[model samples]
Target chain A: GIVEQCCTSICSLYQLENYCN
Target chain B: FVNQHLCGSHLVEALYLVCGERGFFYTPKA
Candidate 1:
């Protein structure tokens, strides 16, 4: 679940900054 | 810049798996 958690958290962080692709 | 950082994190994660190592996770240094 490391990858899953990493993806989720990082993706959310980027999304918060309107940086998600 | 975006591509490089993304790949760097992914690369480190993969290497962590392949090397069976720990004490780290993928994250942009900057």
Candidate 2:
């Protein structure tokens, strides 16, 4: 596995990264 | 432990619910 990661998760509920606090 | 568009958000109440979660889920990929 490359084991590489990125900001995959989202505040999928609210649609804001800011809310992903 | 990272956010994509935190600054680009509107800072409205709709976002409150997500922030309430504290953090988003970390999904793995190839």
What TM-scores do the predictions have? 0.28, 0.24
Candidate 2: fnat, from 0 to 1? 0.29
Candidate that would win on lDDT? 1
Candidate 1 wrong stretches, greater than 4 Å: A1-21, B1-6, B21-30
Give the CA lDDT, 0 to 100, for residue B1 in model 2: 22
B1-30: candidate 1 lDDT, tens digit per residue: 212222445645443444443334443443
DockQ of 2: 0.22
**Model 2's interface RMSD:** 8.6
TM-score of 2: 0.24
- Which candidate should be chosen as best, given DockQ against the real structure? 2
Screening candidate 2 with a backbone cut-off below 3 angstroms (N, C-alpha, C), the clashing residue pairs are: A21-B22
Q: Which stretches of candidate 2 lie over 4 Å from their true place?
A: A1-15, B1-11, B21-30
User: Model 2: how far is B6 from its true place, Å?
Assistant: 14
Chain A superposition TM-score per model: 0.23, 0.21
Inter-residue clash pairs, candidate 1: none
